[PDB]
Amino acid sequence: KRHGSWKIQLNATSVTHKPNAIQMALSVCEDLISSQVYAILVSHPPTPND
């Protein structure tokens, strides 16, 4: 809203963190990459150190 760009559209996609490293890669590839999103945010896990 605050940007003057007209040819740029902002889309927000939410992906929860799977509680397993085995299925984390599949979930990331099936959703994040398939959306052709620009940049991905990395968030700290709920555990203090993981």
Added chain:
Amino acid sequence: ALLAFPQSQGEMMELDLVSLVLHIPVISIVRHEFPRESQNPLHLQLSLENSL
């Protein structure tokens, strides 16, 4: 030992997952060294064509 010739990122991911789950040594030969940050030591990637 497992021998494979993956051609895509999905095939490499499937091979790595199978090697990790089955707890067996797996080696896949690719034409070019596909980047991978996986720390699993059971999956090996063989670059037939190395860097120039």
